Structures are given as C-alpha cells and as structure tokens.
Symmetry: none
Subunit: 63 residues, 4 copies
C-alpha cells in the first residue's frame, strides 16, 4: 500500500537531486511523489500542492 505516510510541500529546489512520480494503483489510491535529496534522504511531497507542481515544472526546465 502507499509508501508515503506524511507529505510535505514546504521545500525548495536546491536540496532535491531527483523526483519519482508513481501513479495510483490497486495498492495506493493516491499518486506518490518521492524526492531524493542531495544528502540521499527521501521525503514524500504533496502532488496537489501548487507549490510542488511548480517545483516539478522547474526541475524539468533545468531551472
């Protein structure tokens, strides 16, 4: 079932090395967004937060 127990939306570009977007499925009704930080740690981001939607579009532009 869902990996992501808690989801943050208060983070800025810089610490994020990569992001992984997992689509909803029979074992999780929510989309999961896992960010890999420069330090190797992982955090779950809220996929609906407009802030987080912005962060993705930027990483995607190389900005």
């Amino acid at each position: 079932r869902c990996l992501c127990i808690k989801t943050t939306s208060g983070i800025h570009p810089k610490n994020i090395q990569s992001l992984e977007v997992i689509g909803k499925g029979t074992h999780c009704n929510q989309v999961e967004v896992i960010a890999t930080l420069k330090d190797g740690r992982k955090i779950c981001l809220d996929p609906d937060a407009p802030r987080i939607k912005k962060i993705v579009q930027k990483k995607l532009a190389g900005d």
Copy 2:
C-alpha cells in the same frame, strides 16, 4: 564519476497509458542536463525529452493523476 548522463538520445513519442512511473533527474555536476526516465508497464525504461511540450504535459497529468 563512472556513471554520468543516461540519456543522450531521447523521445517525445510515448503513450501515457504505457507509463508506470517517471523519474526526473535535475541538472547535477556529474550530468549537466535534466534527464527524464519513464518506467513502462512491461518493465522497459525510456529516455524522454524534458523540453518537449508534450512531455511537460504528460508529467503534469501523471502528477495530478489526470
């Protein structure tokens, strides 16, 4: 840095329904470009063009579970 950039060749032609997960690697020092790797339903992995409008579209839709 033995493993550098994974996607020198990309694609814009992917059917969103074949996509299971997406990984967006940001510009790093080791790979000075953004790489986007889609894992397909059958396990295959393909490099996507981060700049193609369509790909930007598909990412935003996946994110919204649209």
Copy 3:
C-alpha cells in the same frame, strides 16, 4: 524535524520474485537508521527491515542474480 527517516514501518516478508530493485541508504544526520526501499515489479515501493535475516538473505540472492 531533525530525524526525518522515510521508513516508519518495515516488513520482513516479501518474496524475491516481486522485487525489481532495492536501495540501501546509510545512516545519516537526518536518519538514525539504515533504510532499504524495495521497488516492486508493479512500481510500488516498500520499506524492508535491514536487520531481519530474511531480508539479508534476499539482498544476497538479488546480488547473486539468484
């Protein structure tokens, strides 16, 4: 927070066949424990117990391509 592990809950029972890849993240300033995140063939992710002999044996069989 200071302690921000991702793996709150851990399992020891998964059958090797369902595992695609595994990531082992060492102890850090922000996480007092070793985290093992398994990526299943369906794209689902689950935290494994690094201390469980069942788990150590799975890692070894994966490595051996066994």
Copy 4:
C-alpha cells in the same frame, strides 16, 4: 530511446566511507545482468561489480549499518 543496462564498466574498488547509498537492480526486462550503482557522498555514481567478493561484503556491512 530505450534504456537497457546502465553499466558498461564496473569496478570492485571503492572505499565504504564514500558511499551514501547503493541501488541493486536485479536482472529484468531490459538488462540481463544484476547492476549495483553506488551514489557517493559527493553525488557521483559508480558501477560496482556484483560478483566481486569485496563488493558482496560492502553491501552486507552497509545493510548492518556497520
């Protein structure tokens, strides 16, 4: 463009203290070999040799978090 095996080249010599994480990718659709990628504390990625005893050993110590 399709992504198969990431590791053209491998090494059996890394010092454990430079390793921040390890990813073990089992044999799959598009890569009929096991691949081990270490992410160093400086973010570089190195392909490790999964058959080399020294590597098999590093993985188990990283698991035990020793």
